[PDB]
Design an enzyme around this catalytic site. Structure first.
Site, mmCIF file in Angstrom:
data_model
loop_
_atom_site.group_PDB
_atom_site.id
_atom_site.type_symbol
_atom_site.label_atom_id
_atom_site.label_comp_id
_atom_site.label_asym_id
_atom_site.label_seq_id
_atom_site.Cartn_x
_atom_site.Cartn_y
_atom_site.Cartn_z
ATOM 1 N N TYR A 161 0.680 -1.404 0.162
ATOM 2 C CA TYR A 161 0.080 0.056 -0.019
ATOM 3 C C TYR A 161 0.834 1.156 0.119
ATOM 4 O O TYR A 161 2.040 1.310 -0.068
ATOM 5 C CB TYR A 161 -1.144 -0.097 1.161
ATOM 6 C CG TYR A 161 -0.219 0.284 2.355
ATOM 7 C CD1 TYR A 161 0.337 -0.648 3.338
ATOM 8 C CD2 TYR A 161 -0.328 1.397 3.037
ATOM 9 C CE1 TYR A 161 0.975 -0.436 4.636
ATOM 10 C CE2 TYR A 161 0.361 1.902 4.515
ATOM 11 C CZ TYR A 161 0.942 0.895 4.967
ATOM 12 O OH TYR A 161 1.483 1.118 6.087
ATOM 13 N N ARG A 164 7.165 3.564 -5.488
ATOM 14 C CA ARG A 164 7.386 2.824 -4.308
ATOM 15 C C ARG A 164 6.181 1.761 -4.182
ATOM 16 O O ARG A 164 6.374 0.490 -3.566
ATOM 17 C CB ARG A 164 7.245 3.473 -3.053
ATOM 18 C CG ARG A 164 8.002 2.854 -1.822
ATOM 19 C CD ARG A 164 8.301 3.676 -0.637
ATOM 20 N NE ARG A 164 6.906 4.280 -0.155
ATOM 21 C CZ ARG A 164 6.751 5.028 0.977
ATOM 22 N NH1 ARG A 164 7.963 5.416 1.409
ATOM 23 N NH2 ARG A 164 5.944 5.468 1.379
ATOM 24 N N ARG A 193 -7.738 -20.855 -0.491
ATOM 25 C CA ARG A 193 -6.794 -20.734 0.593
ATOM 26 C C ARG A 193 -5.594 -21.717 0.476
ATOM 27 O O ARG A 193 -5.689 -22.828 0.288
ATOM 28 C CB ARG A 193 -7.256 -20.801 2.083
ATOM 29 C CG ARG A 193 -6.275 -20.425 3.233
ATOM 30 C CD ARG A 193 -6.930 -20.119 4.457
ATOM 31 N NE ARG A 193 -5.927 -19.729 5.540
ATOM 32 C CZ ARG A 193 -5.013 -20.661 6.099
ATOM 33 N NH1 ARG A 193 -4.850 -21.977 5.806
ATOM 34 N NH2 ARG A 193 -4.221 -20.249 7.107
ATOM 35 N N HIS A 203 -0.875 -21.217 1.115
ATOM 36 C CA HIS A 203 0.086 -20.270 1.573
ATOM 37 C C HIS A 203 1.024 -19.844 0.256
ATOM 38 O O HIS A 203 1.521 -18.695 -0.179
ATOM 39 C CB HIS A 203 1.233 -20.691 2.406
ATOM 40 C CG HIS A 203 0.513 -20.975 3.895
ATOM 41 N ND1 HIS A 203 1.305 -20.193 4.775
ATOM 42 C CD2 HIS A 203 -0.692 -21.283 4.355
ATOM 43 C CE1 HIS A 203 0.440 -20.419 5.931
ATOM 44 N NE2 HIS A 203 -0.482 -21.012 5.513
ATOM 45 N N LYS A 229 6.383 -1.818 2.008
ATOM 46 C CA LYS A 229 5.111 -1.410 2.900
ATOM 47 C C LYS A 229 4.201 -2.160 2.619
ATOM 48 O O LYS A 229 3.323 -1.830 1.665
ATOM 49 C CB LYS A 229 5.028 0.204 2.229
ATOM 50 C CG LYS A 229 4.100 0.858 3.052
ATOM 51 C CD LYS A 229 3.957 2.379 2.482
ATOM 52 C CE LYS A 229 3.706 3.280 3.825
ATOM 53 N NZ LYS A 229 4.762 3.306 4.763
HETATM 54 C C1 LIG Z 1 4.748 4.196 5.485
HETATM 55 C C2 LIG Z 1 5.837 4.281 6.523
HETATM 56 C C3 LIG Z 1 6.785 5.332 7.001
HETATM 57 C C4 LIG Z 1 6.703 6.574 6.192
HETATM 58 O O1 LIG Z 1 6.851 6.624 4.855
HETATM 59 P P1 LIG Z 1 6.533 8.152 4.201
HETATM 60 O O2 LIG Z 1 6.612 7.853 2.588
HETATM 61 O O3 LIG Z 1 7.267 9.297 4.737
HETATM 62 O O4 LIG Z 1 4.902 8.216 4.496
HETATM 63 C C5 LIG Z 1 7.670 5.169 7.844
HETATM 64 N N1 LIG Z 1 7.864 4.194 8.487
HETATM 65 C C6 LIG Z 1 7.150 3.111 8.391
HETATM 66 C C7 LIG Z 1 7.594 1.828 9.204
HETATM 67 C C8 LIG Z 1 6.003 3.240 7.394
HETATM 68 O O5 LIG Z 1 5.356 1.808 7.168
#
Ligand SMILES: *Cc1c(COP(=O)(O)O)cnc(C)c1O
Ligand SMILES: *Cc1c(COP(=O)(O)O)cnc(C)c1O
EC number: 2.6.1.21
Lengths: 277, 277
Positions: free
Chosen positions: B31, B50, B98, B100, B145
């Site tokens: 995300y 990203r 389901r 893994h 992320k």
């Molecule tokens: C999303 C996130 C951030 C911040 O990233 P930004 O691009 O500045 O919003 C920082 N640390 C973690 C652990 C995150 O998941």
């Protein structure tokens, strides 16, 4: 088929998840998997207790008594007429606008449960399976059986790409667990397995096998063994509700001993079988 | 309201998630969260790069180009007439029974994106916040992320019950990052922050702040610091798309210097302001 939705048995179509369900956005939920042998749920109470225990660890309050939950599970097996397979069920904190911290106690937890016809992996129980050593990169609360499984899918997928059944995780080169199972090793008639701490989920199959070992007068030492000591074992197998006692005959192209299912494994598989419905 | 669903901007009502959505059961997805300042999206290209990067790390193939995505995000901002707030968007591997390991290259990834009116945290940006030291018990791939955030929710909640704004995570007594932000320390006109590895998420706001430091002739040292050294800083603050540059003036009842917002923080906040729409 039919799906358990909170306290209702409904048709799959009628069921729907919200984009703001904390389990969807954060993995804020717990779960279990129960095996059913010819219309009979195997060690259901053990499984129900752990759901409530796992939910309590993250301060989630299930709205039903373990009795209401047991009954609901039984009704689901019948409506679906499940013979041999398994019941999957989870509980998420509920739906609320996106935020990391806990919402107001007002939010009701969402519960989802359903079935699937799936026979015992007999071929694997007999001939054994292949495995690979994968590094443990999962979080530090594996005692909680939660929906935070991205570490496991990446491990399992690596295994699959190599034609392996399971991936054996190790942290600091010390064997911990399988992506979705507990690992056991046998040397000179003694059962070895990593002790129960935050590093591994205290499996139910895992506990049954220890009882079975005690029953057939086989000694057990819950001492951690390394990946090198693993390749030096006489027998090696992994456990999980669906896998039962699956023999591991080869890791990374290295045959464990001669590459045949050992006699002690067989005794454990034979003892285990007596507990199944 | 309107929700981006795959490639369609539809009403919140027409959108429905399936229980076997891999992101729901395994946290299998990534995300982003962009900020909108008066109808204008801040650093949107950086965030989309990203997202695709994070998807690629777990082998998810987004079906649209970065343009079609950009275009869609813009439509979503207008349809909702979002003035000042943020956009949240995510991608999961899709819906499949389901298991893994990854499904087949048949299953399409489920895309969800929606807005929310949310002003700038003026109070925090001016007076600073309190924080608390919490041990990092997260998985080893924070460079992605993903939706595997249970560690984050459990950390934020702890800070919250202690009446703190954020939780400063440390692993092996070395400060890594906050539950949902990057940490920065200042000592003798030099800027310190943990280097970009699997331990921390390389945030966009983090990089902006580092560019804002070069522009004001401030020396930046990407050297990790312990918790013992964190408490000894002249200044201290955290960063993220929504907290921007929030100053931390106290960690566990212990003031950072005099408990006031430092001058270097003020200069960075001032320079950061110039980049805002
Ligand atoms: C999303 C996130 C951030 C911040 O990233 P930004 O691009 O500045 O919003 C920082 N640390 C973690 C652990 C995150 O998941
Ligand atoms: C579910 C699970 C197991 C197996 O527990 P059982 O009760 O035997 O099914 C083992 N390890 C992990 C990491 C698990 O998530």
């Amino acid at each position: 088929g039919y799906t358990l939705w909170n306290d209702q048995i409904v048709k799959d179509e009628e069921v729907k998840i919200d984009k703001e369900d904390r389990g969807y956005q954060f993995g804020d939920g717990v779960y279990e998997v129960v095996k059913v042998y010819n219309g009979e749920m195997f060690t259901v109470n053990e499984h129900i207790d752990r759901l409530y225990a796992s939910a309590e660890k993250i301060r989630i309050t299930i709205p039903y008594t373990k009795d209401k939950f047991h009954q609901l599970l039984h009704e689901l097996v019948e409506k679906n007429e499940l013979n041999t397979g398994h019941i999957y069920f989870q509980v998420t904190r509920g739906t609320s606008p996106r935020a990391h911290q806990f919402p107001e106690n007002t939010v009701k937890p969402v519960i989802i449960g359903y079935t699937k016809e799936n026979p015992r992996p007999l071929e694997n129980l007999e001939k054994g399976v292949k495995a690979t050593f994968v590094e443990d990169i999962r979080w530090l609360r594996c005692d909680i059986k939660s929906l935070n499984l991205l570490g496991a899918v990446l491990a399992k997928q690596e295994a699959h790409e190599k034609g392996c059944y399971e991936a054996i995780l190790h942290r600091n080169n010390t064997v911990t667990k399988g992506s979705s199972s507990n690992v056991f090793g046998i040397k000179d008639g003694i059962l070895y397995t990593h002790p129960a701490n935050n590093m591994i989920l205290k499996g139910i199959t895992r506990d049954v096998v220890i009882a079975c070992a005690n029953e057939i007068n086989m000694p057990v030492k819950e001492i951690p063994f390394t990946t090198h000591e693993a390749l030096k074992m006489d027998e090696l197998f992994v456990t999980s509700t669906t896998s039962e006692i699956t023999p591991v005959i080869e890791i990374d192209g290295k045959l464990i001993r001669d590459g045949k299912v050992g006699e002690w494994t067989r005794k454990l598989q034979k003892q285990f079988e007596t507990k199944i419905p």
